[PDB]
Design a protein around this ligand. Structure first.
Ligand SMILES: [Mg+2]
Ligand SMILES: [Mg+2]
Ligand SMILES: [Mg+2]
Ligand SMILES: [Mg+2]
Ligand SMILES: [Mg+2]
Ligand SMILES: [Mg+2]
Ligand SMILES: [Mg+2]
Ligand SMILES: [Mg+2]
Ligand SMILES: [Mg+2]
Ligand SMILES: [Mg+2]
Ligand SMILES: [Mg+2]
Ligand SMILES: [Mg+2]
Ligand SMILES: [Mg+2]
Ligand SMILES: [Mg+2]
Ligand SMILES: [Mg+2]
Ligand SMILES: [Mg+2]
Ligand SMILES: [Mg+2]
Ligand SMILES: [Mg+2]
Ligand SMILES: [Mg+2]
Ligand SMILES: [Mg+2]
Ligand SMILES: [Mg+2]
Ligand SMILES: [Mg+2]
Ligand SMILES: [Mg+2]
Ligand SMILES: [Mg+2]
Ligand SMILES: [Mg+2]
Ligand SMILES: [Mg+2]
Ligand SMILES: [Mg+2]
Ligand SMILES: [Mg+2]
Ligand SMILES: [Mg+2]
Ligand SMILES: [Mg+2]
Ligand SMILES: [Mg+2]
Ligand SMILES: [Mg+2]
Ligand SMILES: [Mg+2]
Ligand SMILES: [Mg+2]
Ligand SMILES: [Mg+2]
Ligand SMILES: [Mg+2]
Ligand SMILES: [Mg+2]
Ligand SMILES: [Mg+2]
Ligand SMILES: [Mg+2]
Ligand SMILES: [Mg+2]
Ligand SMILES: [Mg+2]
Ligand SMILES: [Mg+2]
Ligand SMILES: [Mg+2]
Ligand SMILES: [Mg+2]
Ligand SMILES: [Mg+2]
Ligand SMILES: [Mg+2]
Ligand SMILES: [Mg+2]
Ligand SMILES: [Mg+2]
Ligand SMILES: [Mg+2]
Ligand SMILES: [Mg+2]
Ligand SMILES: [Mg+2]
Ligand SMILES: [Mg+2]
Ligand SMILES: [Zn+2]
Lengths: 208, 83, 104, 124, 138
RNA sequence: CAUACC
RNA sequence: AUAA
RNA sequence: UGUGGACCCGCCCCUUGGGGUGUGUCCAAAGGGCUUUGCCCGCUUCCGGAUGGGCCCGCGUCCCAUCAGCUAGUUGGUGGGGUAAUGGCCCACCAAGGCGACGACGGGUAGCCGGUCUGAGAGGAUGGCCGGCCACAGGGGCACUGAGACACGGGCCCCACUCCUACGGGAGGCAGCAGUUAGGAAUCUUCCGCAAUGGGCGCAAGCCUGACGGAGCGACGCCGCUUGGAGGAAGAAGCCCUUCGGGGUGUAAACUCCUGAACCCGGGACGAAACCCCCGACGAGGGGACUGACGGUACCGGGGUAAUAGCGCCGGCCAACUCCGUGCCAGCAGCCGCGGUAAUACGGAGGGCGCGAGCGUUACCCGGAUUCACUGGGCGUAAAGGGCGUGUAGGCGGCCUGGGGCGUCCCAUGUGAAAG
């Protein structure tokens, strides 16, 4: 997807299992288990107290590097979520989570988001029966996210959905397998996601 | 002489006209006396021509003169139809 | 509406013309304090009627000269020379304030 | 002051005189070298510092600094100055752009390359 | 001379309370009195009364404090924490009804003088006027 | 300590 | 004499 | 001919030269076309409407007081001329006025606005795209023609400059579209089309539009998109460090499978329905035909390749430390400051942080700067109380009652164009 580099060296910088890879991250790796310290020749010496700033910075990185998104595109969302009405923090989360590239991951078509990004850019994903090849596209509520009719018997997709048979998908998403079809029921609320981010902090970093 | 004509308001390749009354010597997209309807040629939406016959009729009644196009649109939205 | 100001004649030393002085109380933009502020108009006195000390209403009118765009609309109160003297000292002061000479 | 005084006089706004009359406002200005020199710093510094006296298309004679370890400027070299005081030589307010006109880019430099103005070392 | 007699009172009061007097005397005016009417009503004083010192007419204000306190310094909390003239001579301050200030989120008042008479902030807003903003009290 | 002059 |  | 209008005088209403009315005088026209006795397009006079303007007024509109006095058409009057029209707009004669510390006069700078940037706001800065107004068309004057001009691609004259010249004389005017050259840190194609919208003339067919709609160049700006996705060692090689055990780059690579930017093939637009023509009546209404610059583009369908990554930074402020080289040198540096032989600050390397078709730099504006303070500052010793008085203007002003309603407050209503 974007960033396109070593992802698990980011798991190892945030000191958190980030799952930027899905499958193997559940193995005995994700980088974290076995070697859970920072990347670089130095990331194993006694860590100095993070400045007030680093703390709020590293926390944003933790959120942005999850959804795999340019800072230019992250901040654009945050500012919008800011101007918007409601707890500007959770509206932000609502917005990231409303992204098509991510909703495809949530409905387990891809096993990662990097994989879900490409699944869209290569046109295997449809919204409301029309095709959408933009990771950015904002899913609204009531929309149905299908797997493209002529993409259905594809290898990467088959394994990915026989694995989805018998698994639960978020309380704000519908999903029927065999039909390769989801449904965006509602914008998730703050306690619906289990993100390892303070998020309150992310707001503070964008007013430094 | 005051006209009733299409002022250009879309964007590149996406044109939307704004049917207006204006002095015929104004620049095409300049200051007008009054808007009395709009019109998208590409019919991108279920509503793509609107008029307000009364204002259209009013202006005609005082010698507003419609371009051969605005007249078509005017006619089509039933501006003239007397039966 | 033809604008109508009320003022004080501070001059009739002029054929058929008075110099009405009009003041305006108003709150100051930035600082909010109320400041007076006043302006001299030349008014058309066609029948050399009003004399200095008169307090007159002045009316917006088609121009009689340059400077002259008002006609004296009516008389309010008369005789009050305080403001005339008021205005008169005001200019007598100017005698100092210079480089040259004159007791202000 | 009293309000009547602010009324009478008022606050006078602040003028902000430039640190760098490269006229025009302009980002940079071209000129010619009319001498390359070595200059001693002050304060607790010592070294030999490369400067130029430049005469500008601004019609201005200013003394620019010549950054980088290696430089190739001569008593008739045309050059592009660009503002940026050197903290140690008093009266040196502008820098010279390395990589523009007669001024060579620094040689065999690998780090802060675009200041100093050197291309991209090429290989596989 | 006494240039602002309202500030004189407002202050006279502020001064008295900070040394915890039982009462204080201001020389009298209906307008001063019409303010004390509000101070009293809204709970800031105990009330006042037209006394009479040396044959000239004063308004004795009766001040009001907290209970005695704990630790070092037992001097009680003040009731009139804060009280200050807004509009003054050579800077008169007038406000529309849409501009009458919410003092301390209403924990305090703002007496203003309107053509319906002297009034609190809540009073004018819920009565539709504006006027000369006299003073905040909190 | 490293320097600068008579 | 000068820099720490 | 006089519907009617204009002018003088009288009368009525009105109140500025507005609207009647009487006598007198004065003032009209143009023809053309056919489906040829009736239609179409024109012409004349008057009244009204619409639209566009002229002029006048209140208030608002940068800096210097190291610019304090300024003015002779100057200020007003009468009568004239002039104009669509008021007016010293201009003229004769008469009065001696007019303006100024509330900043006249002079100087400096500037097209103004809707807006734009910034700011919690008050404020500050700005007026570039777009829209409105003004001004200008090599420089300075001037009028003619017109409903309208003192007229950018109209006229005259004087000036400066380029060109032709038979030596007398003539010709030019990109601050229209492109384009050249010069100056500069720096700013595009001598492109396509009248298909759409708009304009001018024409009854129409049409014609004319470098207005305009499009394409072109430039990462200049915004937005979107790619350089892949899942697996993959208890962890290759090289380079780095080391307490000589090791530790790092690092799931990164290699490699396994999966999608398939680029690219190829096929279909292929919307924008365009009016003018015109036919029925009806040349109305309303119905039927018919023509027309695409962009463009074989957008978009749809099939085929299909693992397929660009840079730049800045890592002493503190400020996210990110280890070797080598250097030795107050070479250098860095936004500020404080680093370098004098063990440099996390200089130059390289490994590693790391931040953004990423960009990343840095310089320049400029607001911010933080309550650092011109109205919101929101100060002056005993930090900068700041005038050496002291007397007092002009100005600012401010005790208690009671009544009138007025200027300030102040309230209700209704008009205006606050579009764009933003
Ligand atoms: Mg600088
Ligand atoms: Mg550097
Ligand atoms: Mg007649
Ligand atoms: Mg007659
Ligand atoms: Mg009359
Ligand atoms: Mg008459
Ligand atoms: Mg005749
Ligand atoms: Mg005939
Ligand atoms: Mg009109
Ligand atoms: Mg005279
Ligand atoms: Mg006259
Ligand atoms: Mg005259
Ligand atoms: Mg001036
Ligand atoms: Mg200009
Ligand atoms: Mg403004
Ligand atoms: Mg501020
Ligand atoms: Mg421009
Ligand atoms: Mg402009
Ligand atoms: Mg020119
Ligand atoms: Mg031309
Ligand atoms: Mg050049
Ligand atoms: Mg055309
Ligand atoms: Mg046309
Ligand atoms: Mg991989
Ligand atoms: Mg395929
Ligand atoms: Mg394949
Ligand atoms: Mg045609
Ligand atoms: Mg017929
Ligand atoms: Mg028809
Ligand atoms: Mg590859
Ligand atoms: Mg740090
Ligand atoms: Mg060692
Ligand atoms: Mg050396
Ligand atoms: Mg060393
Ligand atoms: Mg050392
Ligand atoms: Mg280093
Ligand atoms: Mg540094
Ligand atoms: Mg800020
Ligand atoms: Mg400020
Ligand atoms: Mg201070
Ligand atoms: Mg001292
Ligand atoms: Mg001092
Ligand atoms: Mg003293
Ligand atoms: Mg003195
Ligand atoms: Mg002194
Ligand atoms: Mg005194
Ligand atoms: Mg006095
Ligand atoms: Mg008074
Ligand atoms: Mg009083
Ligand atoms: Mg009274
Ligand atoms: Mg009133
Ligand atoms: Mg608007
Ligand atoms: Zn992982």
């Amino acid at each position: 997807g974007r960033y396109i580099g070593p992802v698990c060296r980011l798991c190892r910088r945030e000191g958190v299992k980030l799952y930027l890879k899905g499958e193997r991250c559940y193995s005995p790796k994700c980088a974290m288990e076995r070697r859970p310290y920072p990347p670089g020749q130095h990331g194993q010496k006694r860590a100095r107290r993070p400045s007030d700033y680093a703390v709020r910075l590293r926390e944003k990185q933790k959120l942005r590097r999850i959804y795999g998104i340019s800072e230019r595109q992250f901040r654009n969302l945050f500012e919008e979520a800011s101007k918007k009405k409601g707890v500007t923090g959770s509206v932000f989360l609502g917005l990231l989570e409303s992204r098509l590239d991510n909703v495809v991951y949530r409905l387990g078509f891809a096993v990662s988001r990097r994989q879900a990004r490409q699944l869209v850019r290569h046109g295997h994903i449809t919204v409301n029966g029309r095709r959408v090849d933009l990771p950015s596209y904002r899913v609204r509520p009531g929309d149905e996210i299908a797997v493209a009719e002529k993409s259905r018997n594809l290898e990467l997709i088959r394994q990915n959905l026989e694995a989805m048979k018998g698994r639960k998908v978020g309380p704000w998403l519908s999903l029927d397998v065999e039909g390769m079809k989801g449904k965006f029921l509602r914008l998730p609320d703050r306690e619906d996601l289990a993100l390892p981010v303070n998020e309150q902090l992310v707001i503070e970093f964008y007013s430094r | 002489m005051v006209k009733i004509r299409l002022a250009r308001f879309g964007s590149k390749h996406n044109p939307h006209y704004r049917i207006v009354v204006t002095d015929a010597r104004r620049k095409r997209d300049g200051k007008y006396i009054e808007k009395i309807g709009y019109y998208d040629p590409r019919k991108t939406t279920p509503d793509w021509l609107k008029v307000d016959v009364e204002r259209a009729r009013y202006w005609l009644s005082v010698g507003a003169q419609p371009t051969d196009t605005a007249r078509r649109l005017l006619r089509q939205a039933g501006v003239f139809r007397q039966e | 509406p033809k604008k109508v100001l009320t003022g004080v004649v501070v001059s009739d030393k002029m054929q058929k013309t008075v110099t009405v002085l009009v003041e305006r109380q108003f709150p100051h933009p930035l600082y909010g304090k109320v400041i007076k502020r006043s302006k001299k108009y030349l008014a058309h006195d066609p029948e050399e009627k009003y004399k200095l000390g008169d307090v007159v209403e002045i009316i917006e009118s088609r121009p009689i000269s340059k400077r002259k765009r008002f006609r004296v609309l009516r008389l309010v109160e008369s005789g009050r020379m305080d403001l005339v003297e008021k205005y008169l000292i005001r200019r007598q002061n100017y005698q100092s304030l210079s480089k040259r000479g004159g007791k202000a | 002051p009293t309000i009547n005084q602010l009324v009478r006089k008022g606050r006078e706004k602040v003028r902000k005189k430039s640190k760098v009359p490269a006229l025009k406002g302009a980002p940079f200005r071209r000129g010619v070298c009319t001498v390359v020199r070595t200059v001693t710093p002050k304060k607790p510094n010592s070294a030999l510092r490369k400067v130029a006296k430049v005469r500008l298309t601004s019609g201005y004679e200013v003394t620019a600094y010549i950054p980088g370890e290696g430089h190739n400027l001569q008593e008739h070299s045309v050059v592009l100055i660009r503002g940026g005081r050197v903290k140690d030589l008093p009266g040196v307010r502008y820098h010279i752009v390395r990589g523009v006109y007669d001024a060579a880019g620094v040689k065999d430099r690998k780090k802060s390359r675009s200041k100093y103005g050197t291309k991209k070392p090429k290989e596989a | 001379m006494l240039t602002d007699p309202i500030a004189d009172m407002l202050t006279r009061i502020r001064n008295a309370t900070r040394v915890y007097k039982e009462s204080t005397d201001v020389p009298a005016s209906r307008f001063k009195e019409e303010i004390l009417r509000i101070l009293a009503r809204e709970g800031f004083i105990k009330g006042y009364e037209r006394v009479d010192v040396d044959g000239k007419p004063y308004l004795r204000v009766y001040l009001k404090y907290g209970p005695r306190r704990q630790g070092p310094d037992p001097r009680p909390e003040q009731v009139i924490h804060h009280i200050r003239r807004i509009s003054k001579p050579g800077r008169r301050v007038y406000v529309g009804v849409k501009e009458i200030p919410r003092v301390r989120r209403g924990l305090g008042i703002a007496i203003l003088s309107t053509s319906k008479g002297v009034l609190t902030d809540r009073e004018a807003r819920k009565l539709g006027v504006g006027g000369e903003l006299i003073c905040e009290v909190w």
